[PDB]
Amino acid sequence: AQLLAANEQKFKFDPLFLRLFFRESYPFTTEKVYLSQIPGLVNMALYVSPIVSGEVIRSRGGSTSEFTPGYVKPKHEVNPQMTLRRLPDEDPQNLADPAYRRRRIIMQNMRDEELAIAQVEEMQAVSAVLKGKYTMTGEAFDPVEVDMGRSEENNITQSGGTEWSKRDKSTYDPTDDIEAYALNASGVVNIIVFDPKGWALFRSFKAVKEKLDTRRGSNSELETAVKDLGKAVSYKGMYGDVAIVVYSGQYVENGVKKNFLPDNTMVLGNTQARGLRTYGCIQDADAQREGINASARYPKNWVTTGDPAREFTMIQSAPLMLLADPDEFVSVQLA
Amino acid sequence: AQLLAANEQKFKFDPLFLRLFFRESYPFTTEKVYLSQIPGLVNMALYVSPIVSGEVIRSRGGSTSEFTPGYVKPKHEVNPQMTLRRLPDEDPQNLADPAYRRRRIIMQNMRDEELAIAQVEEMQAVSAVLKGKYTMTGEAFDPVEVDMGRSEENNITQSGGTEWSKRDKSTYDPTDDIEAYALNASGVVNIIVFDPKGWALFRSFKAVKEKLDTRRGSNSELETAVKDLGKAVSYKGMYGDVAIVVYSGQYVENGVKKNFLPDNTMVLGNTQARGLRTYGCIQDADAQREGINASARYPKNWVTTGDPAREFTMIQSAPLMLLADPDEFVSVQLA
Amino acid sequence: AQLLAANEQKFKFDPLFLRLFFRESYPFTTEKVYLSQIPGLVNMALYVSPIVSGEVIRSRGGSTSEFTPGYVKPKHEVNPQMTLRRLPDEDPQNLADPAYRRRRIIMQNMRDEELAIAQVEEMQAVSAVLKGKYTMTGEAFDPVEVDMGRSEENNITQSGGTEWSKRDKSTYDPTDDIEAYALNASGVVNIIVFDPKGWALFRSFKAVKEKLDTRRGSNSELETAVKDLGKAVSYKGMYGDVAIVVYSGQYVENGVKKNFLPDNTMVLGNTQARGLRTYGCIQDADAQREGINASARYPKNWVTTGDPAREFTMIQSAPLMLLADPDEFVSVQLA
């Protein structure tokens, strides 16, 4: 089989959430995850006279710790009936060699599952900032609930007497409403990312556009982060001191697509809300022998025999996407 | 005759339609086309338990996976009496020798036939993604039809009820219509290709003019693709968020030049579609003898005798320009 | 461990359907079964002009493709414990060597497995020609439907209108019904395979008994199949231009006998009806490293470790028994 060092991927394709909210990463050296091992936040100074030594500061963080991550693991065959994509300006002379073809196929595969893996921690963050509840289920999985510690005002839906859909589309000003939503944000609101169908309702108000600064160039760094995701994310403009993003990326189930966000929903938060990227041990006998129990991803290649007589490529990880302050975002289910 | 090494062109002049959507290519090592060998689409990661168990991900090609390549041969003769094109910086002195005469006329031929066949792949590609229907006809060839699988919702016709011509050119704003036609796109649209006639009635609205971006163009490296083949391809700027482009491509019929697209017909879709460039095998003795049947093009030359005591040059190809998801585009039948 | 040279079967138990309808066999090299690659039939040649360029035969036509094979892999074990089944007329002194008895028991083990896979293909074939539609399902092998394309009038039921039980066994004659069901046969019918208990009532009509001919010897070679499976094949005699046989074949379920023909069934068809014996790929990496992907059967023997410290025996296959023309038979459901 192939050596473990064959990990030539070097691609950063985090779908709009791992690349903006969960910059920090904390792998774990133990199977389960203990939340109480995060570094945490620090107090003021403990002002003291310069004659006596003071007390030592210790940061612990949170109370509940005993969580357990999901353990997805994609596995794939490399049956050399694979019709290789014709790389431009590649000589067909190398196409004769079975070894080059096999290496090409396994490298294509590695990309295949690396696109297959990103989605799970993607909707992990989606569920994180949608309600702050996280249920993980599945066959042969022992479903687990995760409570992030959210309040109920972070999930207010516009469902009263007056809604954005059943009022004036010309004279109403959505601002007063957006600050009414963002007042209980535990911080400055900075991202008002939209679901496109919901944005269709939002933009219907003209009062948006006479104040919508949709100048090219969000802030000169947001586009430096979002152009790579040219298929799923789009940037509208400035609503003054804040940015507007429309995201319609889709996760595909066994046979059909599905959008990550609920249709008529929007969320409020900030670009600097720190989010944890905790991972778990890789319970591979080989991994313990190579001291890589603490990592994010793990490739493997091996040749089985007898019943499934083939050779396979293997990935496994433990994503338990977390956010430091669940209440830093408020979710409005539009109506 | 000249050998197979006489393939020194290495020029990429595909007019805007093999470059924006079908960037990849899949030659086949079989006479027919099987979607089973197509990698297809990635799937979920399937939350599962630890090492206790594990199951293989298997990617299907759907139900229909049989197709007939569009195999075709242009033929030319090398009659050493044809008048040579007066290229610049071309010395007649090193042209008097028949050796240069022949090697230049054969090459000028070579070019004009890949130009014709390239027109052909573009024609079949636009036929496929203009409505989702697609057909394969030709004299001395059995008629063939291919269904891309386009949904009925992505073939909207403007003529029904509410056209664009009989509205007020000063107040009727087409942002509402473009958004209502882009909602059912199965993906955020960013390329808004127009036709030379249809663009006029669209742009006629004054509300369009002010919001239009024209400052040098600020989309992407697409400008590099546009300025190369700028003859039939025109670029205006940004619709606020998306690219506005007018295509005026032409193809040579029996004796008449005809536009690539019907006049009042618009295409809407993404800048990163997944488009297939499948090819059949090269059904001839020699290519099989060097085993290069899996390729886009095949040049070859000989001198045939007896009844046609003359020399001939062939190009063989077999395209079936194909699209994974027909529903990531919508066809607006304007009027 | 024994190699692939352990192929010593030479046993023909093709049960009355492989000799009579399924004469020709063809395994592919691609995973799916495409009918568009059958050799097809050949018609009468043409009287070509003496000295002229001729025509090349092109024997294709009829796609009807894209059917998936019925993969089956029954396992067995070679624990050298059981007393051998004493082979008639074999040298017994060499039984002292345990290596010989191992090489004998592996053969005996392959014998039962090939009997079982013949059982698989036989209830596949009978299920093929009784209604057309063929459903194959099982654990770890998802349900699969294969539709032959039989018209609704190929499965006439005697219960429709007048049954045969409420008929005089001393005055009524079944002839008119015979030609009535024989007209929509897409060919002459000369086989009337019966279910013996539903055929006793067929004999119950007096006219059948004397109208049946009992001259020793069939039309041409019908006894050839009869003399092989004498315990379950019987040839009753002649009915003018149609030959009467009764099949009483049975197969093992997990531990029990089941009959092949449902009680009240008659089938009418032609001796020369074309039925393919298609076979699928062998999904075994060893096959590709020996390039034996195109085969009907595949031996395999290896040694398992850790939990099941045993040695296994394997024959993997995937029959997809097929009819060129589903309307080539009439299955009258008696009543």
Between the alpha carbon of residue C193 and those of residues A235, B75, C237, the distances in Å are 73, 60, 12
CA-CA distance, C189 to A42, in Å (whole number)? Answer: 93
Q: Could you tell me if C242 and C191 are in contact, meaning their C-beta atoms sit under 8 angstroms apart?
A: yes
Alpha helices in chain B (DSSP H): 98-131, 175-182, 198-203, 206-211, 222-228, 285-289
Tell whether B186 lies on the interface with A, counting CB pairs under 8 A.
yes
CA-CA distance, C156 to A298, in Å (whole number)? Answer: 61
Q: Could you tell me if A264 and A333 are in contact, meaning their C-beta atoms sit under 8 angstroms apart?
A: yes
Residues 6 or more apart in contact with residue B223 via CB below 8 angstroms = B217, B235
Which of C124, C123, C108 lies closest to C11, judged by CA?
C108
Give the phi and the psi of residue C219 in degrees, each rounded to 5: -60, -70
CA-CA distance, C13 to C112, in Å (whole number)? Answer: 12
Which residues on chain A are in Cβ contact (under 8 Å) with C299? Answer: none
Residues 6 or more apart in contact with residue A28 via CB below 8 angstroms = A34, A37, A278, A279, A280, A281, A294, A318
Name the residue of chain A whose CA is nearest to B293's CA: A92
Which of B13, B84, B5, B15 lies closest to B299, judged by CA?
B5
CA-CA distance, C114 to C14, in Å (whole number)? Answer: 11
Give, in degrees to the nearest 5, the angle at Cα C238 between C236 and C240: 155
Resolution in A: 5.0
CA-CA distance, A28 to A16, in Å (whole number)? Answer: 24
What is the layout of strands, in order, in the sheet containing B75-77? B75-77, B310-316, B298-304
CA-CA distance, A16 to A13, in Å (whole number)? Answer: 9
Give the chains touching B; criterion: ≥3 Cβ pairs < 8 Å: A, C
Q: How far is C66 from chain B (nearest CA, A)?
A: 7
Q: How far is B22 from chain A (nearest CA, A)?
A: 12
**Which DSSP string corresponds to C66-101?**
-B----B--EEE--TTSPP---SS---GGGG-HHHH
- At A255 the three-state DSSP class reads coil
Which residues on chain A are in Cβ contact (under 8 Å) with C284? Answer: 309-310
Which of A213, A313, A280, A314 lies closest to A37, judged by CA?
A280
Q: Residue B25, by phi and psi: left (phi above 0), alpha (psi -120 to 50) or beta?
A: beta
Contact yes or no for A310 and C31 at CB 8 A: no
- For the record, the structure tokens of C3 come out as 């190699």
**Which one-letter amino acid corresponds to residue B263?**
D
**Which DSSP string corresponds to B119-149?**
HHHHHHHHHHHHHSEEEE--TTS--EEEE--
Largest CA distance in chain B: 81
Tell whether C64 lies on the interface with B, counting CB pairs under 8 A.
no
Q: Could you tell me if A290 and A282 are in contact, meaning their C-beta atoms sit under 8 angstroms apart?
A: no
DSSP state at residue C60: -
Tell whether A80 lies on the interface with C, counting CB pairs under 8 A.
yes
Between the alpha carbon of residue B177 and those of residues A246, B180, B243, C142, the distances in Å are 18, 5, 17, 46
Which of A19, A9, A16, A10 lies closest to A111, judged by CA?
A9
Q: Could you tell me if C72 and C120 are in contact, meaning their C-beta atoms sit under 8 angstroms apart?
A: yes
- For the record, the structure tokens of C156 come out as 């006439």
Residue entry with tokens 């079982």: C116
Tell whether B270 lies on the interface with A, counting CB pairs under 8 A.
yes
Q: How far is B66 from chain C (nearest CA, A)?
A: 7
Give the phi and the psi of residue B18 in degrees, each rounded to 5: -85, -10
CA atoms within 13 A on the CB side of A47: 0
Residues 6 or more apart in contact with residue A16 via CB below 8 angstroms = A226, A229, A232, A233, A245, A247, A249
Name residues 20-49 of chain C within 8 A of B (Cβ). 30-32, 34, 36
Name the residue of chain C whose CA is nearest to B64's CA: C66
Give, in degrees to the nearest 5, the angle at Cα A255 between A320 and B269: 95
Contact yes or no for C32 and B64 at CB 8 A: no
Q: Are strands C75-77 and C311-315 parallel, antiparallel or unpaired?
A: antiparallel
- For the record, the structure tokens of C127 come out as 């299920």
* Closest partner CB to A305 (pick from C31, C75, C302): C302
Rounded to the nearest 10 degrees, how much is the dihedral formed by the CA atoms of B76, B78, B80, B81?
Answer: -10
Cα distance between the two ends of chain C: 56
DSSP state at residue B194: B
**Which one-letter amino acid corresponds to residue C19?**
R
Give the phi and the psi of residue A236 in degrees, each rounded to 5: -85, -65
* Percent helix, percent strand, percent coil in chain B, to nearest 5: 25, 20, 55
Which of B171, B241, B236 lies closest to B204, judged by CA?
B171
Give the phi and the psi of residue C168 in degrees, each rounded to 5: -70, 120
Experiment used for this model: cryo-EM
Which residues on chain A are in Cβ contact (under 8 Å) with B218? Answer: 216
- For the record, the structure tokens of A147 come out as 């409570």
Q: What long-range pairs does C158-167 form, CB within 8 A, spacing at least 24?
A: C158/C264, C158/C332, C158/C333, C158/C334, C158/C335, C159/C333, C159/C335, C163/C335, C164/C201, C164/C334, C164/C335, C165/C201, C165/C335, C167/C205
Largest CA distance in chain A: 80
Rounded to the nearest 10 degrees, how much is the dihedral formed by the CA atoms of C161, C162, C164, C170?
Answer: -170
Which residues on chain B are in Cβ contact (under 8 Å) with A194? Answer: none
Mutate to test the interface with C, among A81, A101, A304, A313 (most CBs of C within 10 A): A81
Contact yes or no for A72 and B183 at CB 8 A: no
Q: Could you tell me if A275 and A324 are in contact, meaning their C-beta atoms sit under 8 angstroms apart?
A: yes
CA-CA distance, B278 to B67, in Å (whole number)? Answer: 10
Between the alpha carbon of residue A265 and those of residues A175, A184, A193, A201, B184, the distances in Å are 17, 18, 10, 11, 18
CA-CA distance, A218 to A245, in Å (whole number)? Answer: 10
Residue entry with tokens 């699928």: C280
Q: Could you tell me if C173 and C207 are in contact, meaning their C-beta atoms sit under 8 angstroms apart?
A: yes
DSSP state at residue C230: T
CA-CA distance, A23 to B232, in Å (whole number)? Answer: 45
What are residue B315's DSSP bridge partners? B299
Which of B51, B73, B32 lies closest to B315, judged by CA?
B73
Contact yes or no for B30 and C31 at CB 8 A: no
Between the alpha carbon of residue C29 and those of residues C37, C282, C283, C294, C295, the distances in Å are 11, 9, 11, 5, 8
- At B281 the three-state DSSP class reads coil
Name the residue of chain C whose CA is nearest to B67's CA: C63
- For the record, the structure tokens of C261 come out as 């023909």
- At A264 the three-state DSSP class reads coil
Which of C120, C79, C71 lies closest to C279, judged by CA?
C71
